[PDB]
């Protein structure tokens, strides 16, 4: 995972191991090495500086200059800083008796497949999901979700071309009633770039449907551009959480590493493979360990 960084961070720590106690200037050099590794993983300057400051403080508070094994102290403190940067404690959207969640994002984020994989996850946890294919302009996008729903065994409502939000809301509520659906997953329109008309429609769909989560699906491999997509969707529509797809293809992790700081939104799920069960709850502590080479490989 995040191969270059992980290698980079492990290299920085390992360059310390077996060489006894270090000085404050030595601690300085390692810290600069970490900061550069993060920046090369596309982390912005402020986020990287904050990370390194966190590590400095916490390492001092653990006697890194007294330790005959300071590499281990740096390992532990880089692991805590990674854990917090990645979100801290693991987070999932809250479940009430009934839920209505939007999935938003660009064409290419894997949003539509993600909607189906989410429905499957929640069905397995005992939910009764309904997928809603809400693109009112592109029948093919709706048909794609129809056939994904058939694969994962989850029902799909398809909107009509040009259907009003009020008509959508009514057809959704009725189907949800009749089928005892308790988790409605609305796959909104995906485009290659955002423009004013869809955003307007979506912000409008949000007013009418009143979702209680708005999950933004981002291709993790887009690094900083994912964060720019996130602020556009958050200011124009309003987001509640993130899903990062193709986390297996991302050698760097910079969007992931920066999301809490920059967006203030949690990463709920990771797409880590093309398997149906490739969409997994996101586990910052687990991922921090992995980046540092601990645990399973
Ligand atoms: Ca309005
Ligand atoms: Na997709």
Curated annotation (Swiss-Prot):
Molecular function (GO) terms listed? Answer: 7S RNA binding; ATP hydrolysis activity; GTP binding; GTPase activity
UniProt EC number: 3.6.5.4
Catalytic activity, as annotated: GTP + H2O = GDP + phosphate + H(+)
Chain positions recorded as GTP binding sites? 105-112, 187-191, 245-248
Q: Name one GO biological process term.
A: SRP-dependent cotranslational protein targeting to membrane
Q: What class of enzyme is it?
A: hydrolase
Cellular component, GO annotation: signal recognition particle
The lineage's top-level taxon is Bacteria
Subcellular location per the Swiss-Prot or TrEMBL entry: Cytoplasm
Alphabetized UniProt keyword annotations:
Cytoplasm, GTP-binding, Hydrolase, Nucleotide-binding, Ribonucleoprotein, RNA-binding, Signal recognition particle
Q: How does it assemble?
A: Part of the signal recognition particle protein translocation system, which is composed of SRP and FtsY.
Quoted from the entry, the domain comment is: Composed of three domains: the N-terminal N domain, which is responsible for interactions with the ribosome, the central G domain, which binds GTP, and the C-terminal M domain, which binds the RNA and the signal sequence of the RNC.
The entry sums up its family as follows: Belongs to the GTP-binding SRP family. SRP54 subfamily.
Give the protein's biological function. Involved in targeting and insertion of nascent membrane proteins into the cytoplasmic membrane. Binds to the hydrophobic signal sequence of the ribosome-nascent chain (RNC) as it emerges from the ribosomes. The SRP-RNC complex is then targeted to the cytoplasmic membrane where it interacts with the SRP receptor FtsY.
Q: What is this protein called?
A: Signal recognition particle protein
Q: Which residues of the full protein are shown?
A: 2 to 297 of 430
């Amino acid at each position: 995972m995040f191969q270059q960084l992980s290698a980079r961070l492990q290299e920085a720590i390992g360059r310390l191991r077996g060489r006894g106690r270090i000085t404050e200037e030595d601690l300085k050099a390692t810290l600069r090495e970490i900061r550069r590794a993060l920046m090369d993983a596309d982390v912005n300057l402020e986020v990287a500086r904050d990370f390194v400051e966190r590590v400095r403080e916490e390492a001092l508070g653990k006697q890194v200059l007294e330790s005959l094994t300071p590499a281990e102290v740096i390992l532990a403190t880089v692991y805590e800083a990674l854990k917090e940067a990645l979100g801290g404690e693991a987070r999932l959207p809250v479940l009430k008796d009934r839920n209505l969640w939007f999935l938003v994002g660009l064409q290419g984020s894997g949003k539509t497949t993600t909607a189906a994989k989410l429905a499957l996850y929640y069905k397995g946890k005992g939910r009764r999901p309904l997928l809603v294919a809400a693109d009112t302009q592109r029948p093919a996008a709706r048909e794609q979700l129809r056939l994904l729903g058939e694969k994962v065994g989850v029902p799909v409502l398809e909107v009509m071309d040009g259907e009003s939000p009020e008509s959508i809301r009514r057809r959704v509520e009725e189907k949800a009633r009749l089928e005892a659906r308790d988790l409605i997953l609305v796959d909104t329109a995906g485009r290659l770039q955002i423009d004013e008309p869809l955003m307007g429609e979506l912000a409008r769909l949000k007013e009418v449907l009143g979702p209680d989560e708005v999950l933004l699906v981002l291709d993790a491999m887009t690094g900083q551009e994912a964060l720019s997509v996130a602020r556009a969707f958050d200011e124009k529509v309003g987001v509640t959480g993130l899903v990062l797809t193709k986390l297996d293809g991302d050698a760097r992790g910079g969007a992931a590493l920066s999301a809490r700081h920059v967006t203030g939104k949690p990463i709920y799920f990771a797409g880590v493979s093309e398997k149906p069960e490739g969409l997994e709850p996101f586990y910052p502590e687990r991922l921090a360990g992995r980046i540092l080479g601990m645990g399973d490989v």
